[PDB]
UniProtKB/Swiss-Prot annotation, chain D:
Location relative to the cell: Nucleus; Cytoplasm
Protein name (record): Small nuclear ribonucleoprotein-associated protein B
Provenance organism: Saccharomyces cerevisiae (strain ATCC 204508 / S288c)
Record note on domains: C-terminal extension may function as a nuclear localization signal (NLS).
Sm domain sequence ranges: 2-77
Miscellaneous comment text of the record: Present with 861 molecules/cell in log phase SD medium.
Protein's job: Plays a role in pre-mRNA splicing as a core component of the spliceosomal U1, U2, U4 and U5 small nuclear ribonucleoproteins (snRNPs), the building blocks of the spliceosome.
Assembly description: Component of the Sm core complex, present in spliceosomal snRNP U1, U2, U4/U6 and U5. The core complex contains SMB1, SMD1, SMD2, SMD3, SME1, SMX3 and SMX2 (Sm proteins B, D1, D2, D3, E, F and G, respectively), and is probably a heptameric ring structure. SMB1 specifically interacts with SMD3.
From Swiss-Prot, chain F:
Gene that encodes it: SME1
Record note on quaternary structure: Component of the Sm core complex, present in spliceosomal snRNP U1, U2, U4/U6 and U5. The core complex contains SMB1, SMD1, SMD2, SMD3, SME1, SMX3 and SMX2 (Sm proteins B, D1, D2, D3, E, F and G, respectively), and is probably a heptameric ring structure. SME1 specifically interacts with SMX2 and SMX3. Component of the U4/U6-U5 tri-snRNP complex composed of the U4, U6 and U5 snRNAs and at least PRP3, PRP4, PRP6, PRP8, PRP18, PRP31, PRP38, SNU13, SNU23, SNU66, SNU114, SPP381, SMB1, SMD1, SMD2, SMD3, SMX2, SMX3, LSM2, LSM3, LSM4, LSM5, LSM6, LSM7, LSM8, BRR2 and DIB1.
Assigned protein family: Belongs to the snRNP Sm proteins family.
Function: Involved in pre-mRNA splicing. Binds and is required for the stability of snRNA U1, U2, U4 and U5 which contain a highly conserved structural motif called the Sm binding site. Involved in cap modification.
Residues of the Sm domain: 5-75
Cross-referenced InterPro entries: LSM_dom_sf, Sm, Sm_dom_euk/arc, snRNP-E
Gene3D superfamilies: 2.30.30.100
Keyword vocabulary terms for this entry: Cytoplasm, mRNA processing, mRNA splicing, Nucleus, Ribonucleoprotein, RNA-binding, Spliceosome
Organism: Saccharomyces cerevisiae (strain ATCC 204508 / S288c)
Listed Pfam families: LSM
Any one Gene Ontology cellular component term annotated for this protein: U2 snRNP
Name of the protein: Small nuclear ribonucleoprotein E
UniProtKB/Swiss-Prot annotation, chain G:
Single biological process term from Gene Ontology: spliceosomal complex assembly
One function term, GO molecular function aspect: RNA binding
Coarse class of the protein's main subcellular location: nucleus
Organism: Saccharomyces cerevisiae (strain ATCC 204508 / S288c) (Baker's yeast)
Name of the protein in its database record: Small nuclear ribonucleoprotein Sm D1
Purpose of the protein: lays a role in pre-mRNA splicing as a core component of the spliceosomal U1, U2, U4 and U5 small nuclear ribonucleoproteins (snRNPs), the building blocks of the spliceosome. Also binds telomerase RNA and is required for its accumulation.
Swiss-Prot record, chain J:
Miscellaneous comment as given in the Swiss-Prot or TrEMBL entry: Present with 3630 molecules/cell in log phase SD medium.
Originating organism: Saccharomyces cerevisiae (strain ATCC 204508 / S288c) (Baker's yeast)
Protein name as it appears in the record: U2 small nuclear ribonucleoprotein A'
Residue stretches of each LRR repeat: 36-57, 58-73, 74-94
Included range, full protein: 1 to 162 of 238
Encoding gene, per UniProt annotation: LEA1
Functional summary from the UniProt entry: Involved in pre-mRNA splicing. Associates to U2 snRNA in a MSL1 dependent manner and is required for normal accumulation of U2 snRNA. Required for the spliceosome assembly and the efficient addition of U2 snRNP onto the pre-mRNA.
Localization: Nucleus
Main location group: nucleus
A Gene Ontology term for the protein's cellular component: Prp19 complex
Coiled-coil residues: none
UniProt GO BP: mRNA splicing, via spliceosome; U2-type prespliceosome assembly
GO terms of molecular function: U2 snRNA binding
Family, as annotated: Belongs to the U2 small nuclear ribonucleoprotein A family.
Taxonomy, superkingdom: Eukaryota
Length: 70, 65, 69, 78, 233, 75, 82, 73, 81, 135
RNA sequence: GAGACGUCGCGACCCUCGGAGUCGUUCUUGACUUGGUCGCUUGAUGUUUCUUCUUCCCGUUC
RNA sequence: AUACAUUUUUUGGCACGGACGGGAAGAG
């Protein structure tokens, strides 16, 4: 029953982490679209599971994304 | 605002234009990278007045208050 | 727009040469306009099978070279 | 070389061509595309191993635009 | 005259048939009309490590070098800064080559030697004097009470060091100064151009560019010129 | 013929051990159960497990792996 | 809305261009396609620590061009009008 | 066009043609196969006819790669 | 529509050569081609990027991963152009 | 009839049987060819010395038949029917060259002419249309 | 610098031996077909693993 | 005569006396 887009929608205003094409991320999701571009707050940059820096307010481009996770 | 990029270029710059592709016209442009030989540690950055940018390059844009 | 004419290769074992210098084998069961492949399961090239049936994405295929003539 | 506006207007000129892999295709542009694919009349792939120019004559070549980087004019027509 | 074509197409003599100005002047210079300083505005942005500086504010900076004292006592940057001295070198070289480029007919060697002698006999000899602070030194960037202490300072280890390290830069600065003075009319002309283009619209700027281009890629002698149409008086 | 979409649907219906390969990434694989379906190859896959490939096992939660970086499916 | 339009409007500009492979390209933009395929004239190719190679005409593809370094003087707001 | 025969057929085709071009360029601006039928022969084509006649008379029996070539129109 | 595509189609039957992104040249009779250069070929040799060669029967290739295609020089004559 | 820029610009240009230019007392002003030719045909002219060339990276074949070459200041050099008379005049070719032809030059009849060329210009593989052999 | 694995060459005791072409219809077109082996006695070239000095000669540059 | 970015193209999986050259000999 649960498709991806609705899951994504649900997960707005909640913690998420993103891997890339590689470095892990960690932040609260602000909003999403059809193309799967992201906008996050309280972004922390997990360099292979090592929080290098806390950027805060960020916007991730879709094509570099690998997966979403809580 | 600062932008992370595919080729390891931290683009600190003033945004002018914006579109579907996340291409950007940029003023007050200050890129940050590192030209290095193996076992070489150098940190380089250059000022540019006006600069167009392509969107596939962009990984993550960010805003430092 | 047009369908990939792989009706010749239907129900035959094919070497799906796939992205990153890898390989797959298996009998061809189906496909679509994007060239995704649905195939009965076989090994990844010494050798080890995973799965009962398998689905390969379109983008990933370098080649699908026919094992059977 | 002349001072053209577009690629289409300079049809059948001898062309240097660069591709993402680093090879250099040289030959006369017979036909262009919506996606910059090129037909080349007498095509020669020229490659450089990591020294000096290695050379291969191909012939009539359809060249995909994905792999094309940039095109340059080698000479005039004929 | 006209030694190249069949009859009358090229003013150039057979002697200099392969003489081409476009290989000496860029399009933005318009054969000496303007001097292209945008490039140096770029490099300058790279030098100041910011963007607070506009093309016009940069030209405002250059103006300092028209004065005999400003470029020395009110420097854009600290005159002992590396980036700055390098920039100044490149710029100076440009201005000089432009100068002699735009005035072929004047004896280059004469001018060079004149400037050099002015540099040795006056500039480095306390040419800058103030009734209050005394005598300024380009190399040490310090003043001096009287000429006496000034002279006995020109043998000191400090001044030896400096005059021995920053000589080329000081000299280049000076050249930038005097050559920019000799080109005041061109400097003004360009600054004007800048303000104009700046106050254009899109179509306007485009048509203007078209004009500069045409002037650049046009025959020096048209098939439709006059020969022997002299008026009297 | 059995289309890919149909296969995906079947898998979803089942809820079976799915082992996904990554595009242009040999060393890593995913192992879970398909929950979602999209017009593209993208899906959501709860109870996923990241795997380092034999040239063990690693902890991982619920994930949607993006359609562009998929390679293999099996279910 | 469109940056394509803006690009088109930029005509006859002597500009540097930067590629995905880092090649610095000094040339006069005679035209650009709807898909960013740059057509230069009076072109000068340099790498990012080695010697220069100059060329008369270069048609560079849109996918390659990372960053077009714009001219010194430019009114951007005006350009951005439809 | 001049027809040459009695040529050393051991020379590779591309080398034969390039030496033929070189040798015959001296008379004016200038087809050879290795089939059984055509081996040891070549057709050399010149822009000018006077060039062909001069070539024929001056190189009759010229030692080329060891053998005396025989030329004819 | 693309004239290169047309050319490719025409080359059907003929012995085309064909390199990929990988750099693995093939030569063979072109069986079928599509708008997207989704080529099939018969009786096809396959060179590795390093050097070694391998004979093979009926290769399929997806145009995405194709780099350049060499067609025989008779087609320069017509009839597409 | 000086070899001039104007002369080179109206000269027949074609693909030979390589890109070749069809061409004088003195070799000069080659700059104007812009290094665009693989071959240059200077046959039947009055050149005295093979000299005066600009840097030409393309140029691989020089056909210099029936001129008056008596001194020398590149893979193939055809000098048939010229005026080279002393073995020592051929010395400058050591600094280049695989195909060399010097037939119909007085130098040809000098004792040991062939062996002299072989030792002084070892890079030559074919001399006067005959294979340089090991023996 | 050395070991594969290929791909195109100097010699030979060897082998081997002599766009074009045809037709239907009409004053010009449409169809159908189409060097190999051994050495190198130090030939040329990619992949792919591992680990330079001294002397003499010939050429460029300052 | 009255025109647009989510698998096949262009939103990319990209990136990290002194030198020089050749040839020969002798040593490790
Ligand atoms: Zn002092």
């Amino acid at each position: 029953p649960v498709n991806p887009k609705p899951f994504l929608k649900g997960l707005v205003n909640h913690r998420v982490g993103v891997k890339l094409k590689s470095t892990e991320y960690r932040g609260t999701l602000v909003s999403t679209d059809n193309y799967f571009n992201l906008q996050l707050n309280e972004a922390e940059e997990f360099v292979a599971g090592v929080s290098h820096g806390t950027l805060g307010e960020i916007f991730i481009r879709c094509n570099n994304v690998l997966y979403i996770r809580e | 605002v600062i932008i992370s990029l595919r080729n390891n270029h931290k683009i600190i710059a003033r945004v002018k234009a914006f579109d579907r592709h996340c291409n950007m016209v940029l003023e007050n442009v200050k890129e940050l990278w590192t030209e290095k030989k193996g076992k070489n540690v150098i940190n380089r950055e250059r000022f540019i007045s006006k600069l167009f940018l392509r969107g596939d390059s962009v990984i993550v844009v960010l805003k430092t208050p | 727009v047009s369908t990939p004419e792989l009706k010749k290769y239907m129900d035959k074992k094919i070497l799906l040469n796939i992205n990153g210098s890898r390989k797959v084998a298996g009998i061809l069961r189906g496909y679509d306009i994007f060239l995704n492949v649905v195939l009965d399961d076989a090994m990844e090239i010494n050798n080890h099978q995973l799965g009962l049936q398998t689905v390969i994405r379109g983008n990933s295929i370098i080649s699908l070279e026919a094992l059977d003539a | 070389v002349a001072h053209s506006s577009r690629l289409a207007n300079l049809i059948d000129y001898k062309l240097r061509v660069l591709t993402q892999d680093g090879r250099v295709y040289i030959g006369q542009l017979m036909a262009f595309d919506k996606h910059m694919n090129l037909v080349l009349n007498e095509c020669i792939e020229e490659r450089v191993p990591k020294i000096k120019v290695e050379k291969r004559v191909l012939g009539l070549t359809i060249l995909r635009g994905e792999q094309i980087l940039s095109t340059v004019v080698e000479d005039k027509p004929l | 005259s006209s030694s190249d074509p069949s009859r009358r197409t090229n003013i150039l003599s057979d002697r200099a048939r392969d003489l081409d100005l476009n290989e000496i002047f860029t399009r933005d210079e318009q054969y000496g009309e303007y001097m292209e300083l945008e490039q140096f505005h770029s490099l300058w942005l790279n030098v100041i490590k910011r963007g607070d500086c506009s093309l016009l504010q940069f030209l405002d900076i250059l103006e300092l070098f028209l004065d005999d004292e400003k470029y020395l006592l009110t420097p854009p940057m600290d005159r002992k800064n590396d980036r700055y001295m390098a920039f100044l070198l490149k710029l100076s070289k440009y201005v000089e080559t432009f100068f002699f480029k735009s005035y072929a007919l004047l004896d280059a060697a004469a001018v060079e030697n004149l400037i050099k002698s002015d540099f040795e006999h006056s500039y480095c000899r306390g040419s800058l004097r103030s009734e209050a602070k005394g005598i300024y030194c380009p190399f040490c960037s310090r003043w001096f009470k009287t000429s006496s202490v000034f002279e006995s300072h020109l043998v000191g280890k400090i001044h030896k060091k400096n005059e021995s390290k920053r000589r080329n830069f000081v000299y280049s600065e000076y050249k930038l100064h005097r050559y920019l003075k000799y080109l005041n009319d061109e400097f003004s002309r360009t600054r004007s151009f800048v303000e104009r283009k700046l106050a254009f619209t899109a179509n306007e700027r485009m048509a203007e560019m078209d004009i500069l281009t045409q002037k650049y890629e046009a025959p020096a002698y048209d098939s439709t010129e006059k020969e022997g149409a002299e008026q009297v008086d | 013929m059995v289309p890919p979409i149909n296969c995906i649907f079947n898998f979803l219906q089942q809820q079976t051990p799915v082992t996904i390969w990554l595009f242009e990434q040999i060393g890593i694989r995913i192992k879970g159960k398909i929950v979602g379906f999209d017009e593209f190859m993208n899906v959501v896959i709860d109870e996923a497990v990241e795997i380092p490939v034999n040239s063990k096992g690693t902890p991982l939660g619920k994930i949607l792996l993006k359609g562009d970086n998929i390679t293999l499916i099996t279910s | 809305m469109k940056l394509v339009n803006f690009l088109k409007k930029l005509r006859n500009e002597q500009v540097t261009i930067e590629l995905k492979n880092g090649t610095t390209v000094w040339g006069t933009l005679q035209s650009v396609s709807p898909q960013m395929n740059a057509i230069l004239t009076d072109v000068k190719l340099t790498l990012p620590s080695d010697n220069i190679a100059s060329l008369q005409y270069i048609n560079i593809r849109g996918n390659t061009i990372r960053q077009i370094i714009l001219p010194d003087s430019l009114n951007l707001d005006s350009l951005l009008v439809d | 066009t001049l027809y040459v025969s009695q040529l050393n057929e051991k020379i590779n085709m591309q080398r034969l043609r390039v030496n033929l071009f070189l040798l015959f360029a001296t008379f004016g601006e200038v087809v050879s196969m290795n089939f059984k039928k055509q081996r040891g022969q070549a057709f050399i084509t010149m822009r000018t006819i006077d060039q062909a006649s001069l070539a024929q008379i001056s190189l009759n029996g010229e030692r080329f790669f060891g053998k005396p070539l025989k030329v004819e129109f | 529509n693309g004239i290169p595509v047309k050319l490719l189609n025409e080359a059907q039957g003929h012995i085309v050569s064909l390199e990929l992104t990988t750099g693995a040249t093939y030569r063979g009779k072109l069986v079928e081609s599509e708008d997207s250069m989704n080529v099939q070929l018969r009786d096809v040799i396959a060179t590795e990027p390093q050097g070694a060669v391998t004979h093979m029967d009926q290769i399929f290739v997806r145009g995405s991963q194709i780099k350049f295609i060499v067609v025989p020089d008779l087609l320069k004559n017509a009839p597409l152009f | 009839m000086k070899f001039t820029p104007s002369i080179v610009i109206d000269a027949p240009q074609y693909y030979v049987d390589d890109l070749q230019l069809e061409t004088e007392s003195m070799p000069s002003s080659l700059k104007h060819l812009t290094k665009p030719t693989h071959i240059l045909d200077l046959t039947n002219n009055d050149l005295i010395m093979i000299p005066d060339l600009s840097r030409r990276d393309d140029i691989h074949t020089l056909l210099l038949g029936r001129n008056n070459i008596v001194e020398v200041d590149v893979q193939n050099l055809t000098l048939s029917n010229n005026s080279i008379r002393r073995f020592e005049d051929l010395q400058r070719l050591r600094r280049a060259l695989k195909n060399l032809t010097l037939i119909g030059n007085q130098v040809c009849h000098l004792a040991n002419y062939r062996e002299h060329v072989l030792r002084l210009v070892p890079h030559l593989e074919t001399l006067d249309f005959q294979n340089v052999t090991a023996e």
